[PDB]
RNA sequence: CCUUGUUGCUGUGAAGGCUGGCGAAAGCCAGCUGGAGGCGGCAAGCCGUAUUGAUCUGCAAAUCAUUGGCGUAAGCAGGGUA
RNA sequence: GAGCCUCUAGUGGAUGUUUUACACAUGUAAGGGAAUUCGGCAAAAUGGAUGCGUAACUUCGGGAGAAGUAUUGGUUCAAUUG
RNA sequence: CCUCGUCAUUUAAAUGGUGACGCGCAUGAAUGGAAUGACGAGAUUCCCACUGUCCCUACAUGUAGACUAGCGAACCCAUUU
RNA sequence: UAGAAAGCGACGCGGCUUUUUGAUUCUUCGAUGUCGGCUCUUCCUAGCAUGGCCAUGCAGCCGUGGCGAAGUGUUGGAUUGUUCACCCACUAACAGGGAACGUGAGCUGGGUUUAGACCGUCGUGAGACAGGUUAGUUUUAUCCUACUGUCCAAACAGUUGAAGGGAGUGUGGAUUAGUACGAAAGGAAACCCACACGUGACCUCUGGUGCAGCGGGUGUGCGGAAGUGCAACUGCCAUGCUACGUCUCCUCAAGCAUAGCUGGAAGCCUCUAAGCUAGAAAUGAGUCCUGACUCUGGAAGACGGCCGGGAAGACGACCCGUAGUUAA
């Protein structure tokens, strides 16, 4: 018989099976379309999640048809996330070829001198090594093997990508001695131009200001917070049963009909929740800056850094460059994230508007924070 | 930037925190937190709550008008 | 859209505040028309989902019945606008407000007010979408 | 049927009695004294209404928890006898 | 000889691990207040003593703790059970 | 029985409750008829107070449960599923 | 209102369906748990709303009859055990059905249908009554298979993408405009902005919670004070977790119904017989989740345990550190 009343499904089947992610560091798996009409540029980067705060911005957005004469301006309060982005270092390149089975890698070429931080990823246990890792490779520079290698890459390739690592030693709160390694794609120009651009930059440091600027739209890829094994009430959102029932209320009561004589994959069951890969599209950059240069607005004539009183709770003080973005972002503090240029441009009016800040909150995140600087606390109390 | 000054405690309130309570007498009043709103309801006199800026001024621990 | 008895001809934009008032709620009448207490029986604009009771915030139009008031007026169905609420609300500028007691005010099908004077304070945002209320309120916040 | 054991704390305040007032009489009204009842709230006990609670390879071939009904009496009980 | 706390006299083992979900015994909750369900089932609310004040009906005994309201700690005094 | 009888009151809305009416399938006088008081862990309807029963669920405690040492069963079974 | 056929369609005639109730007794009486509700998933179309179109007794507004289409929706209550019925309120709309009359080792136990008892009618009686009434025990998974997650098959670092899943839906306001259209009365048609329901995340703010931490009182213990046990009560509140909080959600290609272009058959005509153009919330891809077989690289040592932590966790597994901005 048909059910008595209509209702929507619980949870989305776009994310089933909901299994645990394999490792905590994401690869950018998809990149925006190349265009030979533009200069050679990079398309992505790595970042670390610091924490959250709030800001006040001015706005003037209204319906184009609204008949009001006056150029109304209005304050809006918004929550923001802070990400730390030290410069990445380039250490090699890869070329790929198109086939009936997709892209396949032809060869990889590495710089003559490599850092202790990057060699540390290649071994499993840090403190137990003979360190004979890349010691024979430098001969390939003398032999001309490198010059033969570049020829083959230049002759037979469709897509070119660089290899870059992050300077973990600059962020002590991570307790980490192995760098993270990411493969990043180059768009613009021809294969030859791409290869020459790469060759000029092996061993050097690229700042985040190469890749992104204020007001840009970007996509953020990360792994969510973990929550362990959980029941259907939390995993899929199903309703709790009648209060006087035996054998438990926090369950789906009926898990199928008599035929077919099996359980369907569409029914909710208990299991893992959290620690999955998720991508957030079209987030907007409100600000870019540095952890130890003070700043001011047109209206707030105090001069202060981004760091709140006492630092972010399990991190401390930002020291390197940073990005600020609208809304919340995947995962807890200290997790690695991958940043990408937006896959396609947005038509929505909320996305394409300007941003003008007047205040940024710098009060303590432990307890009720009631001062913006140590000077105010010293003035409120005696002496 | 401040939201204002708390009615009961005397404490200045940061922008984006605290709440206004509006009575049927038609008055609007600003409180720092739920703590001090509740003390008003229970008719605890502020001068007896010794950490308040009000109490400290009344005792003459802090220079005031 | 205008259907059934007591239809409404004067639709306005909702604000997205929290919804403290729902079917079953008894609340005071703030105007001088002669009703005293209203019992909430429906809300305009609600399409509904399974097991959920219809709810309203400031600015919304409710269907109610008169449970206290003058003899001519009792046990009849009427339309009213919600002017204040005991549940907390958040403005887009980040300010939060809370009133001591909730209340509503009676209107005609065309959106005209029934009475001539309104007791006590009224929320600013309501006076932006219902302009006639501005004229006869006690104070605006 | 014969011989025995087992009533603690409290509320209400019948019959009978003493003073004072009112009345021509008959007998009416106050305050106090007295302590009746298969009479009220409880304790020790005796019972078994609800949760259709726990348990249902039990602690148990009828039990356990909270909640209930009566408890100065056609109440409960040991031994001897029919 | 209630519950709670102590003196006399008497008492105890299937080992380690901070230990998800679902349970079984329990706490607390914005705004609303029976909309829940066959059904207020379960829970919450009321609670002792002192005073003020107490309706219909009645076999005149009762109803009756009707209902409805107020007071209550420590200290230092008066006055002698108020 | 027809039947969710008709009219009034209680609700926003009454196959319910109470008040009336009566050719009553098939009421009725110790096969006992009719109207009340006091008393029911008896059946039924409404109001006030009160609340996680519900909107709509969240957090926390004890004991089991997961993993580990010692000890160690039963129902059921043509079986290749 | 003329007029068979906009819409209807008497008197007759041919079919389909299994969602109603019959008819029959093939399977089960060394047992297949029987009505309704609650909870949750999937399917059908005979299309109620939402999208594209054709006819009209289509001026406009509101409608009525038909075509391709099953992606997304279809609610809250009062009386009643009800499925059904009937009213009130909202709505874009409140269509109709199937899955052992879906779903009891998932719950509940109001109805029906054991043993107690009342009433009416029938019987000389014991007793009867698809007549009415009240009280009446809901057991067991530790096996196999399915389903949901977890490890291994697969050294370490960087990747690839076969195949499987799939997601956004609707309402209102403003403007066009008191305009077209109509004697008048009335009265339409993008882009932008606000919201609801659904989906995925997040704690800066505001609610909630009180395990760590600070305070207060009642009864009784340790000769007093100070420090404190037990019975438990009570005010505030870090970190964390959470919603009553905050952020989130479009673009191509091939083409349905239709309306057209060129064009014969058939010197004329004609959307079709070849060929071409515009075309839907529908279909197939991309952006989104899972990740088969592969591919590129470094080096005579590599890797696991043991020891200590967490951002991770049932156990494994994952992320990390071990002579250092290491721990206390």
A33 assigned binding-site residue: no
Residues with Cβ within 8 Å of residue A34, at least 6 apart in sequence: A159, A187, A188
For chain B, the distance separating the N- and C-terminal CA atoms, rounded to the nearest angstrom, is 23
* Selected residues 227-246 of chain A with any CB under 8 Å from a CB in chain C: 239
Spatial contact of C41 and C65, defined as CB atoms under 8 Å apart: yes
Task: Return the number of other C-beta atoms located less than 10 Å from residue A88's C-beta.
Answer: 26
CA of A262 to C1' of F80 (A): 22
How far apart, in whole angstroms, are the C-alpha atoms of residue C30 and residue C40?
15
How far apart, in whole angstroms, are the C-alpha atoms of residue A230 and residue A208?
40
Question: Of A100, A113, A196, A101, nearest to A153 (Cα)?
Answer: A196
C135 phi and psi, to 5 degrees?
-70, -30
Q: Which residues of C touch B20 (CB under 8 A)?
A: 95-98, 141
Asked if the Cβ–Cβ distance from B20 to C139 is below 8 Å, we say no
Residues within a 7 A CB radius of strand F: A 233-234, 239-240, 242-243; C 22-23, 39, 41-42, 49, 51-53, 65, 67, 75, 77
A180 phi and psi, to 5 degrees?
-100, 140
Spatial contact of A49 and A333, defined as CB atoms under 8 Å apart: yes
Does A78 reach chain B within 8 Å, measured CB to CB? no
**In A162-314, which residue ranges form alpha helices assigned H by DSSP?**
191-199, 232-235
What sign does the CA torsion over C103, C107, C113, C115 have?
A: negative
Residues with Cβ within 8 Å of residue C62, at least 6 apart in sequence: C21, C38, C40, C42, C43, C44, C56, C79, C80, C81, C82, C104
How far apart, in whole angstroms, are the C-alpha atoms of residue A93 and residue A198?
8
How far apart, in whole angstroms, are the C-alpha atoms of residue A186 and residue A160?
6
Distances (CA, A) of C102 to A245, C41, C86, C88, C123: 38, 16, 6, 11, 11
How far apart, in whole angstroms, are the C-alpha atoms of residue C72 and residue C50?
37
Spatial contact of A340 and A218, defined as CB atoms under 8 Å apart: yes
Does C92 reach chain A within 8 Å, measured CB to CB? yes
Task: Return the number of other C-beta atoms located less than 10 Å from residue A157's C-beta.
Answer: 19
Give the rounded distance of the alpha carbon of C17 from its chain centre. 14
How far apart, in whole angstroms, are the C-alpha atoms of residue A54 and residue A79?
4
Residues with Cβ within 8 Å of residue A125, at least 6 apart in sequence: none
How far apart, in whole angstroms, are the C-alpha atoms of residue A3 and residue A320?
60
How far apart, in whole angstroms, are the C-alpha atoms of residue C98 and residue C75?
31
For residue A77, give the nucleotide whose C1' atom is nearest its CA: G205
Q: What is the resolution of this structure in A?
A: 14.3
CA of A369 to C1' of G209 (A): 21
A240 in contact with nucleic chain G (CB within 7 A):
no
What DSSP state is assigned to residue A323? E
Spatial contact of A186 and A162, defined as CB atoms under 8 Å apart: yes
Spatial contact of A198 and A186, defined as CB atoms under 8 Å apart: yes
Spatial contact of B18 and B24, defined as CB atoms under 8 Å apart: no
Q: Which residues of B touch A359 (CB under 8 A)?
A: 1, 15
- On strand E, nucleotides with any atom < 7 Å from a protein CB are 20-24, 30-35, 39, 41
Question: Of C112, C88, C111, C87, nearest to C11 (Cα)?
Answer: C111
Distances (CA, A) of C38 to A240, B24, C88: 33, 19, 22
- On strand D, nucleotides with any atom < 7 Å from a protein CB are 51-54
Distances (CA, A) of C127 to A21, A217, C11: 52, 38, 15
DSSP calls for A288-306: EEETTS-B--SS----B-S
User: Position of tokens 């390939």?
Assistant: A140
Compute the half-sphere exposure of residue C22: CA atoms within 13 Å on the CB side of its CA. Answer: 9
Structure tokens at A40: 């050679």
B54 phi and psi, to 5 degrees?
-55, -50
How far apart, in whole angstroms, are the C-alpha atoms of residue A244 and residue A258?
26
How far apart, in whole angstroms, are the C-alpha atoms of residue A284 and residue A217?
5
What was the elucidation method?
Answer: cryo-EM
Spatial contact of B16 and C111, defined as CB atoms under 8 Å apart: no
Classify burial at B58, counting beta carbons within 10 Å of its beta carbon; exposed 0-12, middle 13-18, buried 19 or more. Answer: middle
Does B2 reach chain A within 8 Å, measured CB to CB? no
How far apart, in whole angstroms, are the C-alpha atoms of residue A285 and residue A55?
13
Phi-psi region of A144 (alpha: psi -120 to 50; beta: other; left: phi over 0): left
Task: Return the number of other C-beta atoms located less than 10 Å from residue A207's C-beta.
Answer: 12
Spatial contact of A128 and A242, defined as CB atoms under 8 Å apart: no
How far apart, in whole angstroms, are the C-alpha atoms of residue C119 and residue C139?
9
What DSSP state is assigned to residue C79? E
Distances (CA, A) of A84 to A288, A322, B14, B61: 10, 5, 27, 45
DSSP calls for A88-131: EEEEEEEEEEEETTEEEEEEEEE-SS--HHHHHHHSSSTTS---
Can you tell me whether residue A336 is helix, strand or coil? strand
CA distance C46 to chain B (A): 29
**Pairing status of strand C103-107 against strand C26-29:** parallel
Question: Of A274, A273, A289, A272, nearest to A330 (Cα)?
Answer: A274
């Amino acid at each position: 018989s048909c059910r008595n009343y209509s209702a929507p499904r619980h949870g989305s089947l776009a994310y089933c099976p909901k299994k645990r992610a394999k490792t905590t560091k994401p690869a950018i798996k998809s990149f925006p379309k190349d265009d030979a009409s533009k200069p050679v540029h990079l398309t992505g980067y790595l970042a670390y999640k610091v924490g959250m705060t709030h800001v006040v911005r001015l706005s003037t957005r209204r319906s184009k048809t609204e008949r009001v004469l006056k150029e109304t301006q209005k304050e809006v309060l918004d929550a923001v996330t802070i990400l730390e982005v030290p410069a990445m270092r380039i250490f090699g390149m890869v070329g790929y070829k198109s086939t009936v089975n997709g892209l396949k890698a032809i060869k990889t070429v590495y710089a003559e001198h490599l850092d202790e931080q990057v060699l540390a990823r290649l071994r499993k246990r840090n403190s137990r090594s003979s360190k004979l890792m890349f010691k024979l490779y430098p001969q390939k520079y003398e032999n001309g093997d490198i010059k033969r290698d570049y020829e083959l890459l230049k002759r037979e390739s469709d897509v070119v990508r660089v290899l870059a690592h992050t300077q973990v030693s600059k962020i002590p709160s991570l307790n980490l001695k192995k760098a993270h390694i990411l493969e990043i794609q180059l768009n613009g120009g021809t294969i030859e131009e791409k290869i020459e651009w790469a060759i000029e930059r092996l061993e050097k440091e690229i700042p985040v200001s190469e890749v992104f600027s204020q007001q840009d739209l970007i996509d953020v890829i990360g792994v969510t917070k973990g929550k362990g094994k959980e029941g259907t009430t939390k995993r899929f959102g199903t309703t709790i049963l009648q209060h006087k029932s035996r054998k438990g209320k926090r369950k789906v009561a009926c898990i199928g009909a008599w035929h077919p004589a099996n359980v369907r994959r569409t029914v909710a069951r208990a299991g893992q929740l959290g620690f999955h890969r998720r991508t957030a599209q079209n987030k907007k950059i409100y600000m870019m800056g540095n952890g130890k240069t003070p700043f001011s607005t047109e209206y707030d004539l105090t001069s202060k850094t981004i760091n709140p009183m006492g630092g972010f709770l399990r991190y401390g003080n930002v020291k390197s460059d940073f990005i600020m973005v609208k809304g919340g972002i995947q995962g807890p503090s200290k997790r690695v994230l991958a940043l990408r240029k937006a896959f396609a441009p947005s038509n929505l009016g909320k996305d394409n508007e300007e941003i003008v800040l007047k205040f940024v909150d710098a009060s303590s995140k432990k307890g009720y924070g009631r001062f913006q600087t140590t000077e105010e606390k010293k003035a409120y109390f005696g002496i | 930037f401040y939201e204002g000054t708390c009615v009961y405690s005397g404490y200045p309130v940061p922008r984006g925190k605290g709440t206004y309570f509006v009575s049927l007498d038609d008055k609007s009043s600003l409180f720092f937190s739920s703590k001090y709103k509740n003390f008003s309801d229970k008719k605890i006199k502020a001068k007896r709550v010794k950490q308040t800026l009000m109490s400290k001024q009344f005792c003459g621990k802090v220079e005031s008008v | 859209p205008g259907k059934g008895k007591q239809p409404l001809d004067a639709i306005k934009n909702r604000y997205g505040f929290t919804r403290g008032i729902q079917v079953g709620t008894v609340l005071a009448c703030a105007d001088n028309s002669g009703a005293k207490m209203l019992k909430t029986i429906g809300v305009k604009g609600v399409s509904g989902r399974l097991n959920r009771l219809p709810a309203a915030g400031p600015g919304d139009v409710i269907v109610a019945s008169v449970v206290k008031g003058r003899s001519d007026m009792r046990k009849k169905i009427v339309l009213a606008v919600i002017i204040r609420q005991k549940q907390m609300i958040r403005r887009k500028d980040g300010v939060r407000l809370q009133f001591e007691e909730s209340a509503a005010v009676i209107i005609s099908n065309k959106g005209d007010l029934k009475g001539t004077q309104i007791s006590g304070p009224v929320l600013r945002e309501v006076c932006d979408i219902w302009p006639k209320i501005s004229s006869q309120a006690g104070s605006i916040y």
